[PDB]
Amino acid sequence: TKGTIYSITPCNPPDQLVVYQQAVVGAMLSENFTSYGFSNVVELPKFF
């Protein structure tokens, strides 16, 4: 119709998580959001 264009991002990109002493702790993500019950999402270079 007009000329606008749209990208198609995938729904669920893989997330990197960490475990220690047989429990999960911390998580490397892509979105500035607290997906799990973690109380803080420290923005860091190249990742959250």
Partner: protein, 48 residues
């Protein structure tokens, strides 16, 4: 016997490290189809 010398410089190069790569089995092959994931579910013995 040798008398007073002159200086020179020689250059060498050594490989020291390789950029590591990591892969997600289920993303790579399934590509997000739940039924594909379920057919794969019986092969977790393999791709682990």
């Amino acid at each position: 016997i040798p008398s007073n010398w002159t200086t020179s410089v020689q250059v060498e190069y050594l490989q020291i490290t390789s950029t590591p790569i990591v892969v997600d089995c289920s993303t790579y092959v399934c590509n997000g189809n739940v039924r594909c994931v379920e057919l794969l579910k019986q092969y977790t013995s393999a791709c682990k």
